[PDB]
Design an enzyme around this catalytic site. Structure first.
Site, PDB file in Angstrom:
ATOM      1  N   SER A 149      -1.590   2.907  14.835  1.00 12.21           N
ATOM      2  CA  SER A 149      -0.915   4.081  14.194  1.00 12.21           C
ATOM      3  C   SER A 149       0.522   4.277  14.625  1.00 12.21           C
ATOM      4  CB  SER A 149      -1.669   5.420  14.358  1.00 12.21           C
ATOM      5  OG  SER A 149      -1.285   6.166  15.526  1.00 12.21           O
ATOM      6  N   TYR A 188       2.970   9.835   0.115  1.00 19.39           N
ATOM      7  CA  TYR A 188       4.066   9.140   0.886  1.00 19.39           C
ATOM      8  C   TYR A 188       5.489   9.413   0.432  1.00 19.39           C
ATOM      9  CZ  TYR A 188       0.035   6.395   2.593  1.00 19.39           C
ATOM     10  OH  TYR A 188      -1.181   5.961   2.990  1.00 19.39           O
ATOM     11  N   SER A 244     -11.017   6.042   0.110  1.00 18.78           N
ATOM     12  CA  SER A 244     -10.390   5.899   1.420  1.00 18.78           C
ATOM     13  C   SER A 244     -10.916   7.058   2.279  1.00 18.78           C
ATOM     14  CB  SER A 244      -8.868   6.005   1.277  1.00 18.78           C
ATOM     15  OG  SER A 244      -8.258   5.867   2.556  1.00 18.78           O
ATOM     16  N   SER A 280      -3.925   1.843  10.312  1.00 18.49           N
ATOM     17  CA  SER A 280      -3.668   2.067  11.765  1.00 18.49           C
ATOM     18  C   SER A 280      -4.254   0.886  12.572  1.00 18.49           C
ATOM     19  CB  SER A 280      -4.209   3.428  12.260  1.00 18.49           C
ATOM     20  OG  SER A 280      -3.523   4.482  11.603  1.00 18.49           O
ATOM     21  N   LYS A 312      -2.704   6.109  -4.416  1.00 17.92           N
ATOM     22  CA  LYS A 312      -3.857   6.923  -4.012  1.00 17.92           C
ATOM     23  C   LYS A 312      -3.682   8.311  -4.579  1.00 17.92           C
ATOM     24  CE  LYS A 312      -3.950   4.526   0.414  1.00 17.92           C
ATOM     25  NZ  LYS A 312      -2.536   4.381   0.785  1.00 17.92           N
ATOM     26  N   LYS A 349       2.018  -1.658   8.796  1.00 19.45           N
ATOM     27  CA  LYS A 349       3.338  -1.005   8.518  1.00 19.45           C
ATOM     28  C   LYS A 349       4.376  -1.457   9.529  1.00 19.45           C
ATOM     29  CE  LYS A 349       6.497   2.362   9.639  1.00 19.45           C
ATOM     30  NZ  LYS A 349       7.110   2.654  11.079  1.00 19.45           N
ATOM     31  N   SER A 350       5.540  -1.881   9.017  1.00 21.13           N
ATOM     32  CA  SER A 350       6.720  -2.048   9.865  1.00 21.13           C
ATOM     33  C   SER A 350       7.935  -1.746   9.037  1.00 21.13           C
ATOM     34  CB  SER A 350       6.821  -3.469  10.475  1.00 21.13           C
ATOM     35  OG  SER A 350       7.985  -3.489  11.320  1.00 21.13           O
ATOM     36  N   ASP A 358       0.839  -1.219   0.000  1.00 21.59           N
ATOM     37  CA  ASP A 358       0.000   0.000   0.000  1.00 21.59           C
ATOM     38  C   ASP A 358       0.868   1.262   0.000  1.00 21.59           C
ATOM     39  OD1 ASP A 358      -2.945   1.060   0.648  1.00 21.59           O
ATOM     40  OD2 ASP A 358      -1.555   2.162   1.972  1.00 21.59           O
ATOM     41  N   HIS A 414      -7.711   9.251  -1.946  1.00 21.52           N
ATOM     42  CA  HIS A 414      -7.062   9.118  -0.650  1.00 21.52           C
ATOM     43  C   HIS A 414      -7.980   9.619   0.536  1.00 21.52           C
ATOM     44  CE1 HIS A 414      -2.719   9.028   1.172  1.00 21.52           C
ATOM     45  NE2 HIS A 414      -3.595   8.720   2.133  1.00 21.52           N
ATOM     46  N   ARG A 451       8.565  -9.808   9.471  1.00 20.19           N
ATOM     47  CA  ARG A 451       8.502 -11.279   9.399  1.00 20.19           C
ATOM     48  C   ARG A 451       7.461 -11.824  10.370  1.00 20.19           C
TER      49      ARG A 451
HETATM   50  N1  LIG Z   1      -5.602   5.860   3.573  1.00 16.26           N
HETATM   51  C1  LIG Z   1      -5.118   6.636   4.565  1.00 16.26           C
HETATM   52  O1  LIG Z   1      -5.481   7.768   4.854  1.00 16.26           O
HETATM   53  C2  LIG Z   1      -4.094   5.956   5.486  1.00 16.26           C
HETATM   54  C3  LIG Z   1      -3.766   6.496   6.770  1.00 16.26           C
HETATM   55  C4  LIG Z   1      -2.842   5.809   7.609  1.00 16.26           C
HETATM   56  C5  LIG Z   1      -2.224   4.649   7.143  1.00 16.26           C
HETATM   57  N2  LIG Z   1      -2.467   4.265   5.816  1.00 16.26           N
HETATM   58  C6  LIG Z   1      -1.729   3.061   5.287  1.00 16.26           C
HETATM   59  O2  LIG Z   1      -1.762   2.028   6.293  1.00 16.26           O
HETATM   60  C7  LIG Z   1      -0.437   1.680   6.606  1.00 16.26           C
HETATM   61  C8  LIG Z   1      -0.477   1.194   8.114  1.00 16.26           C
HETATM   62  O3  LIG Z   1      -0.989   2.204   9.136  1.00 16.26           O
HETATM   63  P1  LIG Z   1      -0.029   3.012  10.008  1.00 16.26           P
HETATM   64  O4  LIG Z   1       1.006   3.665   9.234  1.00 16.26           O
HETATM   65  O5  LIG Z   1      -0.861   3.957  10.804  1.00 16.26           O
HETATM   66  O6  LIG Z   1       0.723   2.044  11.042  1.00 16.26           O
HETATM   67  P2  LIG Z   1       0.193   0.679  11.742  1.00 16.26           P
HETATM   68  O7  LIG Z   1       0.202  -0.425  10.871  1.00 16.26           O
HETATM   69  O8  LIG Z   1      -0.848   0.897  12.703  1.00 16.26           O
HETATM   70  O9  LIG Z   1       1.496   0.416  12.549  1.00 16.26           O
HETATM   71  C9  LIG Z   1       1.901   1.198  13.735  1.00 16.26           C
HETATM   72  C10 LIG Z   1       3.298   0.740  14.175  1.00 16.26           C
HETATM   73  O10 LIG Z   1       3.236  -0.614  14.539  1.00 16.26           O
HETATM   74  C11 LIG Z   1       4.604  -1.053  14.630  1.00 16.26           C
HETATM   75  N3  LIG Z   1       4.549  -2.543  14.465  1.00 16.26           N
HETATM   76  C12 LIG Z   1       4.323  -3.169  13.265  1.00 16.26           C
HETATM   77  N4  LIG Z   1       4.365  -4.456  13.521  1.00 16.26           N
HETATM   78  C13 LIG Z   1       4.502  -4.631  14.862  1.00 16.26           C
HETATM   79  C14 LIG Z   1       4.648  -5.737  15.671  1.00 16.26           C
HETATM   80  N5  LIG Z   1       4.528  -6.980  15.185  1.00 16.26           N
HETATM   81  N6  LIG Z   1       4.922  -5.546  16.965  1.00 16.26           N
HETATM   82  C15 LIG Z   1       5.006  -4.323  17.549  1.00 16.26           C
HETATM   83  N7  LIG Z   1       4.900  -3.209  16.788  1.00 16.26           N
HETATM   84  C16 LIG Z   1       4.633  -3.410  15.450  1.00 16.26           C
HETATM   85  C17 LIG Z   1       5.332  -0.302  13.467  1.00 16.26           C
HETATM   86  O11 LIG Z   1       6.553   0.259  13.990  1.00 16.26           O
HETATM   87  P3  LIG Z   1       7.974  -0.326  13.343  1.00 16.26           P
HETATM   88  O12 LIG Z   1       8.069   0.254  11.973  1.00 16.26           O
HETATM   89  O13 LIG Z   1       9.034   0.225  14.401  1.00 16.26           O
HETATM   90  O14 LIG Z   1       7.757  -1.856  13.400  1.00 16.26           O
HETATM   91  C18 LIG Z   1       4.327   0.783  13.013  1.00 16.26           C
HETATM   92  O15 LIG Z   1       4.983   2.016  13.132  1.00 16.26           O
HETATM   93  C19 LIG Z   1       0.364   2.982   6.361  1.00 16.26           C
HETATM   94  O16 LIG Z   1       1.841   2.751   6.311  1.00 16.26           O
HETATM   95  C20 LIG Z   1      -0.200   3.372   4.998  1.00 16.26           C
HETATM   96  O17 LIG Z   1       0.180   2.324   4.056  1.00 16.26           O
HETATM   97  C21 LIG Z   1      -3.411   4.881   5.012  1.00 16.26           C
HETATM   98  C1  LIG Z   2      -3.745   7.756  12.259  1.00 15.23           C
HETATM   99  O1  LIG Z   2      -2.882   7.809  11.117  1.00 15.23           O
HETATM  100  C2  LIG Z   2      -3.301   8.615  10.087  1.00 15.23           C
HETATM  101  C3  LIG Z   2      -4.524   9.282  10.093  1.00 15.23           C
HETATM  102  C4  LIG Z   2      -4.844  10.099   8.980  1.00 15.23           C
HETATM  103  C5  LIG Z   2      -4.030  10.211   7.890  1.00 15.23           C
HETATM  104  C6  LIG Z   2      -2.853   9.517   7.889  1.00 15.23           C
HETATM  105  C7  LIG Z   2      -2.500   8.772   8.969  1.00 15.23           C
HETATM  106  C8  LIG Z   2      -2.228   9.770   6.722  1.00 15.23           C
HETATM  107  C9  LIG Z   2      -0.865   9.157   6.346  1.00 15.23           C
HETATM  108  C10 LIG Z   2      -1.107   7.934   5.500  1.00 15.23           C
HETATM  109  O2  LIG Z   2      -1.965   8.015   4.560  1.00 15.23           O
HETATM  110  O3  LIG Z   2      -0.449   6.914   5.846  1.00 15.23           O
HETATM  111  C11 LIG Z   2      -2.985  10.606   6.016  1.00 15.23           C
HETATM  112  C12 LIG Z   2      -2.632  11.167   4.601  1.00 15.23           C
HETATM  113  N1  LIG Z   2      -4.110  10.893   6.720  1.00 15.23           N
HETATM  114  C13 LIG Z   2      -5.114  11.739   6.287  1.00 15.23           C
HETATM  115  O4  LIG Z   2      -4.938  12.567   5.372  1.00 15.23           O
HETATM  116  C14 LIG Z   2      -6.310  11.836   6.985  1.00 15.23           C
HETATM  117  C15 LIG Z   2      -6.589  12.997   7.719  1.00 15.23           C
HETATM  118  C16 LIG Z   2      -7.818  13.044   8.398  1.00 15.23           C
HETATM  119  C17 LIG Z   2      -8.690  11.950   8.323  1.00 15.23           C
HETATM  120 CL1  LIG Z   2     -10.146  11.909   9.082  1.00 15.23          CL
HETATM  121  C18 LIG Z   2      -8.384  10.848   7.595  1.00 15.23           C
HETATM  122  C19 LIG Z   2      -7.194  10.785   6.917  1.00 15.23           C
END
Ligand SMILES: NC(=O)c1ccc[n+]([C@@H]2O[C@H](COP(=O)([O-])OP(=O)(O)OC[C@H]3O[C@@H](n4cnc5c(N)ncnc54)[C@H](OP(=O)(O)O)[C@@H]3O)[C@@H](O)[C@H]2O)c1
Ligand SMILES: COc1ccc2c(c1)c(CC(=O)O)c(C)n2C(=O)c1ccc(Cl)cc1
Length: 303
Positions: free
Chosen positions: A203, A50, A148, A199, A79, A252-253, A45, A112, A260
């Site tokens: 997150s 990004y 999204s 998240s 996105k 995300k990691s 993703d 997005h 792994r």
């Molecule tokens: N569409 C949107 O608006 C939106 C918003 C947010 C996220 N996203 C997408 O979703 C992906 C994931 O969400 P996110 O970035 O918020 O993070 P997330 O997946 O909730 O991860 C939070 C943290 O968990 C840690 N982690 C991962 N595996 C773990 C494990 N097995 N044990 C303990 N800690 C662990 C990671 O730190 P380490 O790196 O130190 O392992 C990561 O920083 C993003 O990278 C992006 O691709 C999209």
């Molecule tokens: C908790 O972590 C978040 C929450 C929101 C985020 C992102 C990461 C990222 C980073 C990413 O996409 O990984 C983007 C770009 N966000 C938004 O723009 C966004 C802002 C407000 C709302 Cl309500 C929804 C989404």
């Protein structure tokens, strides 16, 4: 393995999250995306926002060139960022993402967020943005299209559009045990739209967006108790919770061991009592919680 989307394509149910904050060197996304593919991830993703599509793309091409995977085995998402919602901007934005990643198509292209910005907020009818997303699918630039950060009303906006050609295949939204989106999940399931959780591990807690007083999901006592019960980890409980409710889940990691570890989500399951204990954690906590968007006219959490 995978879920069949409403346009006939297949999406792997565990995805690798690639966002890292600006202070992380850009080269790291190359290293970790290669490790993800090695560990077993097949859904990757990314997004224009990004600033990593070049590195994520080079990782994918590198793993194709060494014979580990074929392009068709990889599901890559990008996105459309919110400065590009005006419909004349959507195809050029996607072509730019393809050129950065050096790919001929994305498996999935999303809007997005519904919160349009000046191409400072912008007012844009997202139905018109969606028609332009449809044309990108017709042209073969994106195999599937989705959205999204849409709430129910905003999704209904699209589903009810006169002349709609393609439903969104998915809505990728914040979703984890403190904000589990049950009602939105039921609505998505009723329309054969996949909910994709971001998240899901609580997150990255970025200071720009997240109140540091907010509870730390992976320190939750219920998740820690289930991790001890199953001799897994709190992160794996959190990911498995999502698979068992029919949610496709991202993780995300940027750490080799945790990358792994995350693929172990396929190796165990949770009982109904475990699932009920997790569902008990719901508390309407979206970690995104900032004035920078809470006051936008299309802020999704105002419903
Ligand atoms: N569409 C949107 O608006 C939106 C918003 C947010 C996220 N996203 C997408 O979703 C992906 C994931 O969400 P996110 O970035 O918020 O993070 P997330 O997946 O909730 O991860 C939070 C943290 O968990 C840690 N982690 C991962 N595996 C773990 C494990 N097995 N044990 C303990 N800690 C662990 C990671 O730190 P380490 O790196 O130190 O392992 C990561 O920083 C993003 O990278 C992006 O691709 C999209
Ligand atoms: C908790 O972590 C978040 C929450 C929101 C985020 C992102 C990461 C990222 C980073 C990413 O996409 O990984 C983007 C770009 N966000 C938004 O723009 C966004 C802002 C407000 C709302 Cl309500 C929804 C989404």
């Amino acid at each position: 393995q995978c879920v069949k989307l409403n346009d006939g394509h297949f999406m792997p149910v565990l995805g690798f999250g690639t966002y890292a904050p600006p202070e992380v060197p850009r080269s790291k996304a190359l290293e970790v995306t290669k490790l993800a593919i090695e560990a077993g991830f097949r859904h990757i993703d990314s997004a224009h926002l990004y600033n990593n599509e070049e590195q994520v793309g080079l990782a994918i091409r590198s793993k194709i060139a060494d014979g580990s995977v074929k392009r068709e085995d990889i599901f890559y998402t990008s996105k459309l960022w919110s400065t590009f919602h005006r419909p004349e901007l959507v195809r050029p934005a996607l072509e730019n993402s393809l050129k950065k990643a050096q790919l001929d198509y994305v498996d999935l292209y999303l809007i997005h967020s519904p919160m349009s910005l000046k191409p400072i907020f912008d007012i844009v009818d997202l139905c018109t943005t969606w028609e332009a997303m449809e044309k990108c699918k017709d042209a073969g630039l994106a195999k599937s299209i989705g959205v999204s950060n849409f709430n129910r009303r905003q999704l209904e906006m699209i589903l009810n559009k006169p002349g709609l050609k393609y439903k969104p295949v998915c809505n990728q939204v914040e979703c984890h045990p403190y904000f589990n989106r049950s009602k939105l999940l039921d609505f998505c399931k009723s329309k054969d739209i996949v909910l994709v959780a971001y998240s899901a591990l609580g997150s990255q807690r970025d200071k720009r967006w997240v109140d540091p007083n907010s509870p730390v999901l992976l320190e939750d006592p219920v998740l820690c108790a289930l991790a001890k019960k199953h001799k897994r980890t709190p992160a794996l409980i959190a990911l498995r919770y999502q698979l068992q409710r029919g949610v496709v889940v991202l993780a995300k990691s940027y750490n080799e061991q945790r990358i792994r570890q995350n693929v172990q989500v396929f190796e165990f399951q949770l009982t109904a009592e475990d699932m009920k204990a997790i569902d008990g954690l719901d508390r309407n906590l979206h970690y995104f919680n900032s004035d920078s968007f809470a006051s936008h006219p299309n802020y999704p959490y105002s419903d």
